[PDB]
């Protein structure tokens, strides 16, 4: 945690949590495009996931 921001606040991605949200989403994408899910699940629906 950081102390209270001095000035007006807008949504920022450098917060420790966002990154945790970002790596997990980034990690799953690599599960979706892994060699297991490439063979079984269709390719036209793998882009949607």
């Amino acid at each position: 945690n950081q102390p209270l921001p001095r000035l007006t606040v807008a949504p920022t991605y450098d917060s420790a949590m966002s990154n945790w949200i970002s790596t997990t989403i980034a990690f799953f994408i690599r599960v979706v495009n892994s060699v297991n899910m490439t063979a079984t699940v269709n390719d036209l629906t793998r882009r949607t996931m």
Binding site: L7, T8, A10, T12, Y13
Partner: protein, 49 residues
């Protein structure tokens, strides 16, 4: 403002530096109405890597 609209549109993959504190990249683009709050990457594209 025209430049700001896109830079606030994809502020997740491409982070730039907004020249002042008080506003960020995901600030609404309508607020970029003072001359001093023009981002330095926009005044000189060599600062954007």
């Amino acid at each position: 403002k025209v430049f700001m609209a896109l830079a606030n549109l994809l502020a997740q993959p491409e982070p730039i530096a907004i020249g002042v504190p008080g506003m960020h990249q995901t600030t609404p683009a309508s607020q970029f109405s003072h001359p001093g709050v023009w981002p330095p990457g926009f005044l000189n594209p060599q600062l954007i890597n």
